[PDB]
């Protein structure tokens, strides 16, 4: 629907994906159709980035949620600085938060089981503020993203 560009829905998508990466999906009714489609395509992107940029990703130490947030904001800002928005770029936002939570799990100085909820929050903040209008104009998650990325 059109309200799926609001923060709450995006936050749930970002949290769903981190729980997917961390292998702790919550035993509710299950992730939404949107999330189920997003998890497969974002993970495929994530594993390709971690491979080709392995040596690159070993030069930064995500020791805290603050380092993850500034690193996320910095990298994402430069990715979208040309003003272009598309579903592929939005997918890479989720892929990158998955890269960050994996590094946090290993390197976080004081690990906290709620940390991935803080990551999901500033991920959703970025998506809403920088792509929310574009998402709505292109059908939202249900009528835009899912229609283009769901199985043939």
């Amino acid at each position: 629907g059109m309200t799926d560009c609001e923060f709450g829905y995006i936050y749930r998508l970002a949290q769903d994906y981190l729980q997917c990466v961390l292998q702790i999906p919550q035993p509710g009714s299950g992730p939404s159709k949107t999330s189920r489609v997003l998890q497969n395509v974002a993970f495929s992107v994530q594993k390709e980035v971690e491979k080709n940029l392995k040596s690159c990703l070993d030069n930064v130490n995500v020791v805290s949620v603050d380092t993850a947030r500034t690193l996320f904001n910095q990298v994402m800002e430069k990715e979208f600085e040309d003003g272009i928005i598309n579903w592929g770029r939005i997918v890479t936002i989720f892929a990158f938060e998955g890269i960050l939570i994996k590094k946090l799990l290993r390197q976080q100085i004081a690990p906290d089981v709620d940390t991935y909820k803080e990551i999901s929050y500033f991920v959703a903040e970025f998506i809403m503020n920088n792509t929310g209008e574009w998402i709505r104009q292109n059908g939202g998650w249900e009528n835009g993203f899912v229609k283009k990325f769901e199985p043939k």
Binding site: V41, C56, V60, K78, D82, R89, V91, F96
Partner: peptide, 23 residues
């Protein structure tokens, strides 16, 4: 330098997978 390499590769792979043209 690091943050530019990450931003570049993400932008590349983004516009790459973006050609999921369906519906």
């Amino acid at each position: 330098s690091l943050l530019e390499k990450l931003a570049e590769y993400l932008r590349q792979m983004a516009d790459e997978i973006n050609k999921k043209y369906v519906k």
